[PDB]
Amino acid sequence: EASSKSYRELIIEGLTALKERKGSSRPALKKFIKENYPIVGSASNFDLYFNNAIKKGVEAGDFEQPKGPAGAVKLAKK
Hints:
Subcellular location: Nucleus; Chromosome
Distance between the termini: 29 Å
Protein name: Histone H1
PDB class: structural protein
Number of helices: 3
Family: Belongs to the histone H1/H5 family.
Number of domains: 1
Function: Could act as an H1-type linker histone. Has been shown to bind DNA.
C-alpha cells in the first residue's frame, strides 16, 4: 500500500527487481530505478541518494557492496 518510497527501497526493491543471483552493480540498480522505475532513476542527483541508501543499507548489514575497480550491490545480510 502507500508508504512513502525511499532510496533504500530502490536498492532493496532493485535487488528484488534485479532478478539476478550473481549480483548487481550501482548501475544495475539505478537502471532499475530509472527504467524498471520512473525517471526518479532517470534523473541525476538521485544517483547520490541511492548511493547513501546502498551504504546505509549495506552498512546496516542489509545489502552487500564490495569495492574493487567499482562495486557490485548484492542483497543479503552481512
